[PDB]
Design a protein around this nucleic acid. Structure first.
Ligand code: NA
Ligand code: NA
Ligand code: NA
Length: 326
DNA sequence: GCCG
DNA sequence: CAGTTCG
DNA sequence: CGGCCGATACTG
């Protein structure tokens, strides 16, 4: 489908540069310009042919031009030398742009430096320990094995439990960055305080290797982010994210967890324009917001039994998971 | 960065 | 709280 | 001018 990879290749480099340096809004700007150019059909050929495209402005158009003319972007040759390092550091799970910039300011330039001299949080030490594994995707077939593993351990103590793999898996991708397992129960209450049992069952069989986010000393735990590894030879550590939700929030939870991320954001931005609000918990109407668009009035939750209801309530035609990459 |  | 993370 | 998703859910 990519009819502009010549340009949406030089821009991505610029986009990730801005992202790692912390200029998040400018990076979001570039992401959309790129997220669009790709979705095009014909290779842009005119400054006017560019502007006409949503997500592209005069500034972006100009840069697009210099490429379809200079085959290069002068900007890319003035990118700070720190960027590759910031990117290297930022790819450690648990370390964001603030930690990357700090480490760099402190003279660190490689993972070696980070390993031997950086002060690491428990999450970052886990992230560094599986640095290569966290950058690899897995065949969807393996994701299936992981979901099945969790579902089996979950239904083992309550067969009523509904378990579904979401994210890229549900969107039908060939490979998955991690496994997103959503768990809920049709009765509306049996899903309470199950984490304790599930996580222990999984730890028992040595399936879980590391925990990244798991507030277990509190019975109100909603999510778990960790590392698991199927048994046998040739197996790599994989990221596992599990959320347990009340049946009444099932649809919204499923929509959220299925993504994509940019899809969720667009849909939520849409809800806001209609005086509504969408979250992994619910779709609300009559929401009261202030001048800066901040939620200052809860409004009321709308009945959303299925994903279709959410789309319907927002005045949108339904979309199968596979059609939600953006 | 884009857009209203 | 600031940072980072999930989709 | 100023928002860009969510009153993310955790961590320390
Ligand atoms: Na990171
Ligand atoms: Na995922
Ligand atoms: Na914990």
């Amino acid at each position: 489908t990519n009819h502009n990879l010549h340009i949406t290749e030089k821009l991505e480099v610029l986009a990730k540069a801005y992202s790692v340096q912390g200029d998040k809004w400018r990076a979001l700007g570039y992401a959309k310009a790129i997220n669009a150019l790709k979705s095009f059909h014909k290779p842009v050929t005119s400054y006017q042919e560019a502007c006409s495209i949503p997500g592209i402005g005069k500034r972006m158009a100009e840069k697009i031009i210099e490429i379809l003319e200079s085959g290069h972007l002068r900007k890319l040759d003035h990118i700070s030398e720190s960027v590759p390092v910031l990117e290297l550091f930022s790819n450690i799970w648990g370390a964001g742009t603030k930690t990357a910039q700090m480490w760099y300011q402190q003279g660190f330039r490689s993972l070696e430096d980070i390993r031997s001299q950086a002060s690491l949080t428990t999450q970052q030490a886990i992230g560094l320990k599986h640095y290569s594994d966290f950058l690899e995707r897995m065949p969807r077939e393996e994701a299936t094995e992981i979901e099945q593993t969790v579902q089996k351990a979950a239904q083992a103590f309550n067969s009523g439990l509904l378990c579904v793999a979401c994210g890229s898996y549900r969107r039908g991708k060939a490979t998955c960055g991690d496994v997103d397992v959503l768990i809920t129960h049709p009765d509306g209450r049996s899903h309470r305080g199950i984490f304790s049992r599930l996580l222990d069952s999984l730890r028992q069989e040595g399936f879980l290797t590391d925990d990244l986010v798991s507030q277990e000393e509190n019975g109100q735990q909603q999510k778990y982010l960790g590392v698991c590894r199927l048994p046998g030879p040739g197996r790599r550590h994989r990221r596992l994210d599990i959320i347990v939700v009340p049946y009444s929030e099932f649809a919204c939870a499923l929509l959220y967890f299925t993504g994509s991320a940019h899809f969720n954001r667009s849909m939520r931005a849409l809800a806001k324009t209609k005086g509504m609000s969408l979250s992994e918990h619910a779709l609300s109407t009559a929401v009261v917001r202030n001048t800066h668009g901040c939620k200052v009035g809860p409004g009321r939750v709308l009945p959303t039994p299925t994903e279709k209801d959410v789309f319907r309530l927002l005045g949108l035609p339904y979309r199968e998971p596979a059609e939600r990459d953006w």
